[PDB]
Structures are given as C-alpha cells and as structure tokens.
Amino acid sequence: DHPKYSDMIVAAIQAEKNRAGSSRQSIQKYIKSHYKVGENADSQIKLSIKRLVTTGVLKQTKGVGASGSFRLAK
Amino acid sequence: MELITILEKTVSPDRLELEAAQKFLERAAVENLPTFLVELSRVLANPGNSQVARVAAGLQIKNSLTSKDPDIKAQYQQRWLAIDANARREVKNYVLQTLGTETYRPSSASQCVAGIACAEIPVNQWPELIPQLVANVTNPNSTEHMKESTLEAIGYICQDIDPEQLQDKSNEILTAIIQGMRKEEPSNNVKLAATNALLNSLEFTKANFDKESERHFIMQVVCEATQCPDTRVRVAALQNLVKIMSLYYQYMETYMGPALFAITIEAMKSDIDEVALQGIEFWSNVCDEEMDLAIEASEAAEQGRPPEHTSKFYAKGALQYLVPILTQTLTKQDENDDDDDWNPCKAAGVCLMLLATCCEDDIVPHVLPFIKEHIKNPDWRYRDAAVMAFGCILEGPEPSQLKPLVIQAMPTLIELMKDPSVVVRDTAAWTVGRICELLPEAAINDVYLAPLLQCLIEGLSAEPRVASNVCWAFSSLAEAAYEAADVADDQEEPATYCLSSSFELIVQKLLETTDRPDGHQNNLRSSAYESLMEIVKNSAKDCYPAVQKTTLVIMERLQQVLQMESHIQSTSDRIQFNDLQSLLCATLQNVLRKVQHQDALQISDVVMASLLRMFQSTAGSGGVQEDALMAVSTLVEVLGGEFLKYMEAFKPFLGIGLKNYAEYQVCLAAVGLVGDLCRALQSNIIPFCDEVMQLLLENLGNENVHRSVKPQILSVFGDIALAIGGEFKKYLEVVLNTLQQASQAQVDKSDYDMVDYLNELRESCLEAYTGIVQGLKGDQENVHPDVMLVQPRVEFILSFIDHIAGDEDHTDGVVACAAGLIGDLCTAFGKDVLKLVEARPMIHELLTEGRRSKTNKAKTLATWATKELRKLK
C-alpha cells in the first residue's frame, strides 16, 4: 500500500514553512529529510508539483519552473 | 560465528549459506534478535575486519534499526526498546569501539541512533552518555581517527535526531564543544564534521544563541578558521553563515572590514579558482544581505525609524570599484550553452538584479560608459557584457536616470535591432522587451510592427543560439500587438489580425524551426516549445484550413517524436520528451474549442490508432499514465463518445487491467474513463460481464475501494443498456444506501480539507438516479427483498431513516432521494406508520409551502403518500 505522496508534499511544504524563504531546494531536501521514497521519487513527485502549478494551484515567486521559490495564489 | 562474515557470505557462492542467512535475518526481524546485535557490535568494534564487511554490517544493522519508511524507523525504535537493555546497551557498547576503527561512506549507526534517540531521549532512556561524550571530547586521548569518525557520527546524529531531543544534554554538549573548538585542533575532517554537525543542529539552538556573547565568541573562533587552506571546512562554515544569517540575522561589521573586505578584494584579484567557487556562492548571499542594509538605511532615513541593526553603506563606498570589474567579468562565455549548470556567474547575476534594485545612482554612471564601450564590441564574449550590464539596471535604479536613456535609445534601438551584426539585433530585441519590461517608455509600434515583423520573419531561420532571446522578444511583441487592437472598448477576442495573411507561413515555419539538431546552444528548445501553446493559444482557427492539414502535420511531428521515445533508456531523455507532450496537452487544448464535426473526429480516430498501438506497448511500465487520459475526458464530448468502432481493444488489456491488483490510482483514471464510457457501450456487452462479476465482487467486497466510486459502479451501465444489459432494478435500495451513508459519514468540516472536493460525489449518485428514473421509473423491486429477511433490522431501517429524514430543510441531493422514498416508502408497507410518520417538524412549514404556487412535481408526490397514509388510522 503506497501512501498518497502529494499529501506528504503538502505536509512537507507546510512543515518546511517560512513567510520569507520559499526556495524549492529547502523543501526538496526536507523531503530528503525524515524518510525517503523510491529512487524515482524526485522525478515523479517533481512532475506532480509541476503539473499542479500548471493547474494554477500555486503561484510563482522566484525563479522559473521547479528551480525557484514560490507562493500560494490568492 | 559473526554476521560480518555473513555479509561476505551473503555474496558467497554457497547457496545454502546465503539462504540460511537471509533466513535468520528475516526471522530475527520477527524474532527481534535479542543477542544478534551484541555479537554484531563486538565484531564491528573489532578494527580487524575489512571496510566492506563492516560497512555492509552497518547496512544490515541499519536496516534493522532505521529505515527510509518513517514508520519502519519508528518501529525499529520500538523494536529496540523491546530488546533487552543488557543486550541492547551492550550492542551500543561494542558499537563505540567501531568509531575510528573503520571507514564508512554513510554512517548508519548514526542515523539509527538519532532515529531511536528520537524515542529514548524523549524518555531519557539513554541520555546519560552525552555528558560522558562531553568529557570524552573535552579531554582527548583518542587517536585522530577514533575522535574523527566519532565527530562525523555526531554530525549525522544531530541530523537524524528528533529536533526536540538533544536538548537535555545540550549543556554538556556545549561543554564538549568549547573544548573541541580551539584553533589548535589539526584534522580538517574532524573539524569539517564539527561544522557540519553545527549545520545539523542549527534547528533548535535558540537559547544558547540568545546570548550575543556566545555567538560572537564563536564568530571569533570562526575568524581564526578563515585562513586555513582546506576548502571543505570553509564551505561548511559559509553554509552555517547563511543559516545563521537567515534566522538570527547579526552584524558582520566586525569581520567585514577586518576580514571580509580585504580577503574579498585580493580574491577578486586572485586569478585562482579558489575565489571562483568557494567564495562566490556565499558572496552572492552576503551582497544581497548587504543590499538589505542599503535599503534598510535608505528607507529608515526615509521612514524616520532607527533600525535596531544598522547599515554601513560599504556598498556606496564600493559601488564604483564594483561596477567596472563585474562588467568586465562577463567575457568568459561558452559557445554551446546548456542552461543546467550552476556557477559563480548565476549567483552574481541574481545579486546584480537583486542588489541593483537596492543599488544607488552611482552604478548608472558606472554602467552607461560601459554600455557604450562594448554594446558593439567586436567580440561576442565582450559585446555582451555592455548590453547585459545595461539591461540589469533598467529597474533597480530610480527612473530619473533610466527613463531618458530609453527615450533617446528607442529611436536608435529600432535601427539597432536591424544592425548587420546579428548579435546586436538578437540581444537588441530581447533587451527591448527588457526595456518595456523594466521601464515604461513605449507600448506599441505602428511603422515598425510590420517592418520589425518583417525582420523577425527572417529571424525565424537562424541558429538556436541566436533564437533563444528571440522567443521571449516575440512574447513581448505579442504583448505589444495586443495594444494596437484593444483601443478603449472592444468586442470578444477578435477573430482576424492582419498577419493571418502571412500567418500561415508563421505556422508552417515553426515545426521545422523548432525541431533542429543543435539544441544544446543557449537553452533554445524550451523557450520555443513553451510560447507555442501560447502562440497556439494566441492564434485563431475559425477559418481552420491550416489547423486541419497542419494538424496532420502535427501528427507527423508526433510520429517523428514517438520513435526516440519508443526506446528511451535514459530518465532525462524520457523526462525531456514529456516536455513537448505537456506542450501538446495545451496546443490541442488551444485547438479543441472547435470540434469541426468532421475532419477533427476522423483525425482523432487516426491518431487514436496511433495513440493506442503504443498503448499496446505502454503496458507494464507505467507509461502514458495520464497525458492521454486528460485528452480523453475531452474527446468523448466531441461526438457524444459513442465509440462504436472503439473498445474492442479495451476488453482484454483492461480486463486484465481490472485483474491487476496493483492498480489503484491507475484504476482511478480508468474510472473517469468509464465515466466517458456511459455513452458508448450501446451493444452486446452481456458475456464479458461474468469477468466484471469477479472483478467487481473483489473490489466492491473489499472496503478499501474508494467511497466516491459507488455511483460510477452503476451509472456506466446505461450505455450497456442500449443492447445487452439484463439486470433489473434491484439496485435501487443500495443507491438509497449511498445517500444514506454520506449522511452517515460524520464529515466534520472543521478544516478546509474534506470540502475542496466533497460536493462532487453528490453529483455522481444524482446523475445515477436521474438516468435510472429517466430511462425507467419504479418504486421498489419486489417491495423490499431485505425486509423479507432483514425485517427486525428493517424497523430501525425506518427509524434511523426517520432520523435521516428528521431535518426540515435538506440539501437538494438528499431531498431527491427522499422524494422517491416518499413514494415507494408508502408503497412498501404500513408497519409502524403512525409512530414513525409522526416524527418531524416543518410539516406545517411544508404544507403551507406546498399550497404555494409554482411548486414542482415533488409537492404532488407527497400528497399521494397520503393514499397509503389513509391505510392506517
């Protein structure tokens, strides 16, 4: 049984929360933090994030694409 | 004997000796290995074993104590506390020897220790050692390595520890720290590990650090540290500086002039690479951090607020020295440019733009002359530095200096963007968009839009390297052409724009242009492939002669693509290829508004044949999991999703696909697929249902099955209903069960997590009943079959349903189920009618409301319920 990874992602982002700092790197290693998923976690999760950005779930802040720091939309 | 031998024997050609090993380890996991660990600890402690058998021993022990599964790591912690202390602690005892007696790239005991500690520190099961550790490091007699691998272990522990745990022994740790930080310590490995330990511990330090004195005394030792040749300890230190900089931001005035400034100026002069890598990423952090000072003081003096922390304006005294070197520094280019590397340059650029915003007017006098001097430098690595430096200061400095230059620049720019030197026109165009981007001098061109676009048409056919700043220059141009038609008032988005006369050429030049081999230069590909969904978005196909033929061309491009992706053996290559696909699941979106009712459908069918043979090859690898399905939930809407020709292939691979236990979310998708299916299983669906019967029984029988997928179970039978569906309406009650469980679901909407999707399922069973009642209307099947043998329970079936119906006002979806209940509920039987019937309020609130005009059919239904109501009295 695989737990829902995206829910984990939201929890991790909230866990790795800051109102100034937003850089993805921090959240990413946060995922590296605590435990670890299957070797292809980075690719598949990362694509999930990317696609939910495309849906407008979250709003860009710094950088472009998954290299940046980002904030929620209003 | 010992397991370490076993690790070597886990790879030993002796079959049985390996199976027996892989046997005690899977039993011992269940058995809990009470001594096993102690014995392993003693051998591991023994420096007489090869590094391999011991690092492997650490991986097994590790795999028996910690894990990449949070839960499994916490259970190994509970499994540990389950193990006897004599043997457990005894294991710890022999484990200490190993520190220094081996080399392990990853410390596994550290990660286990910290993980379990997260379980024993909280209860103080074994927090006593720490002070002993403190004495162990405040008095050193252990060889270098013994203390070294041990400090690396402490680092990992500080990392893997539950942040709320090494507090109890923080004081003792700080003692250990003080004796361990003196400048005298020699080994750069142990020192580095100590800095990295600091790094891992930086989360919860606050009380020790809430004293200016200690942090500064540290700063002191760190300064003694800044001249040592080994790079690694320095890096770990600048990293610490960054985090200490971010959380508890403190003054570097003491060390900036004394050590940060002099060091930096020579490093700048230092031709060596030391300056280039170790000192520049951190440098970008400090420069912007300082920018925080020139803007905090240049607003504090503008806000009449005295900052608790005060700026120094080193930057104002240094802007001038700084402007000429960085600008001269932009010359070491790389002809073939792939945008995936990180280097001092990017950090510098961010600081330049970020700092530039912070930067004062001194830089402009320092950049304008530089712009003039290289904007036409004959070189390419040089010519860029002038223009680039100019484009970076278009928004940072205040508009008084910036707006005039753009004004007189604009007349020159149009001719410049047409300068023989193609580079001048390339960088010129990107820059112009950078101007309207950073200054607001110009918004539209009338005698240049066409001429410029005449130049741009010709620009369409050059080298990628020249084209990457062109895709965005084009984007901004689209931004401009929107302000030559918008005017003051406007109709819906205009169907026709003048280029449409030559636009067809645009659309016919893009596919070839976008598919060139020399893609590695300047990161050209992405910037083109994106603007496409936008230019497609920013295109009109109402006439659509090109969308058709061009579409078949698109297939041809697709086919072209689907051949390197038929054999993608590299994750990056496959991932890279899904870029264009993603872009396709947006260009099709930008064409699909018009079905066109003929050719579009035929084209999809041809393409579908194309989409599916690869699907006929997408099985077992997880490929094309959702990129095509998204499209599918839109293709059915084109012709009502009849699918007369299709679904023949669908029967076995999904029939085994409904047999595959592993699919969960995969099957989730097939559900919205099945949603689109409700309009296509018109005939001869009866036999391949016994199949559905085992699969449906297995998934439905298991509770795990998604709560949402209750209506879809029956709602996709209507298409089967056209021909070859034969079950009668004995399923009506179970739908009277679902709307009965969503009420039963005590979904406390205290938080915004359950609601964001919630009012979707209602629309499911709603569409279900709607289709049922529409196609067929019946109160009940054989009255109620369960009452026949669930009667005693049927009492309550009507009393808690009576409580379900207790509410005077209900949601429309619940109400719809209730109205049917009013009818067949009076048709079922009269038992317990008087008591259950006299159950709830709003009866007069409803009777009055009923006599009100324009009431629908539902009001009439209630009155009938009065025939059977006049069946008891």
Report domain extents, chain A: 1-74
Q: Write down the experimental method used for this entry.
A: cryo-EM
Mutate to test the interface with B, among A34, A35, A47 (most CBs of B within 10 A): A35
Q: Dihedral sign, CA of B32, B34, B39, B40?
A: positive
- B560: which 2 tokens? 């072209």
For residue B234 the two structure tokens come to 């320095």
In terms of Cα–Cα distance, which of B132, B40, B46 is closest to B92? B40
Q: Which residue of A has its CA nearest to B161?
A: A34
Q: Which of B69, B571, B582 sits opposite A43 (nearest CB)?
A: B571
Minimum Cα–Cα distance from B200: chain A residue:
A33
CA nearest neighbour of B768 among B724, B710, B723, B821: B710
**Alpha-carbon separation of residue B339 from A28, B517, B520, B529, B636 (angstroms):** 20, 17, 9, 15, 40
**Cross-chain Cβ contact B67/A54 below 8 Å:** no
For the record, the structure tokens of A74 come out as 């209003």
CB-nearest to A35 from B70, B582, B664 is B70
How far is it, in rounded angstroms, from Cα B838 to Cα B834? 6
B249: left (phi over 0), alpha (psi -120 to 50) or beta: beta
Note the Cα B802 to chain centre separation in Å.
47
**Among chain A residues, CA nearest to B159:** A33
Tell me which DSSP letter residue B494 carries: P
Beta strands in A1-74 (DSSP E): 58-64, 67-72
Backbone φ, ψ for residue B164 (5° rounding): -85, 45
Distance of CA B784 to the CA centre of its chain: 51
φ/ψ of B776, rounded to 5, equals -145, 145
To the nearest whole Å, the CA of A74 is away from the closest chain B CA by 15
Q: Is B647 left (phi over 0), alpha (psi -120 to 50) or beta?
A: left
Give the residue from chain A lying closest to B118, CA to CA.
A34
Contact B311, B293 (CB under 8 A): yes
**Rounded Cα–Cα distance for residues B113 and B129 (Å):** 12
DSSP string covering B850-862, please? HHSTT--HHHHHH
CB atoms within 10 A of CB B545: 9
Contacts of A54 in chain B (CB under 8 A): 582
3-state DSSP assignment of residue A68:
strand
Q: For residue B574, how many other CB atoms are within 10 A of its CB?
A: 15
Query: Resolution reached, in Å?
Result: 7.5
Q: Cβ of B578 and A43 within 8 Å?
A: no
Other beta carbons less than 10 A from residue B727's beta carbon? 11
List the domain boundaries for chain B: 15-873
Q: Which residue among B68, B575, B578 places its CB closest to the CB of A35? A: B68
Backbone angles phi, psi at B125, to 5 degrees: -65, -45
B-facing residues of A in 2-61 (CB < 8 A) are 2, 20-21, 34-37, 40, 43, 47, 51, 54
Q: How far is A20 from chain B (nearest CA, A)?
A: 9
Neighbours of B510 (CB within 10 A): 18
Chain A, nearest residue to B346 by Cα: A63
Nearest to B164 by CA among B114, B95, B96, B108: B114
For residue A73, give how far its alpha carbon lies from the nearest alpha carbon of chain B (Å).
16
Q: Copy the structure tokens of residue B104.
A: 């392990």
User: Quick check: A40 and B67 CB within 8 A?
Assistant: no
**Least Cα separation, residue B707 to chain A (angstroms):** 16
Q: Assess B62–A contact: CB distance below 8 Å, yes or no.
A: no
Q: Per the structure block, which two tokens stand in for B864?
A: 């009938």
Closest by CA to B312, choosing from B246, B254, B253, is B253
Number of CB pairs, chain A paired with chain B, less than 8 A apart: 18
Comparing CA positions, the residue from B246, B178, B149 lying closest to residue B170 is B178
- What residues of chain B lie within 8 A of the CB of A40, using their CB? 571
Beta carbons of A35 and B571 less than 8 Å apart: no
CATH level 2 (architecture), domain B15-873: Alpha Horseshoe (1.25)
Contact (Cβ atoms closer than 8 angstroms) between residue B499 and residue B485: no
Backbone angles phi, psi at B589, to 5 degrees: -65, -30
Residue A72: DSSP 8-state:
E
**Given an 8 Å threshold on Cβ–Cβ distance, is A37 in contact with B68?**
yes
Q: Which positions in chain A touch B571 (Cβ < 8 Å)?
A: 40, 43
Which of B710, B626, B633 shows the shortest CA–CA distance to B679? B633
Cβ neighbours, 10 Å, residue B363: 26
- Judged by CB atoms closer than 8 Å, whether chains meet at B69 and A34 is answered as no
- Cα–Cα distance measured from residue B96 to residue B664, given in angstroms and rounded to the nearest whole number: 46
Q: Please give the residue of chain A at the shortest CA–CA distance from B246.
A: A21
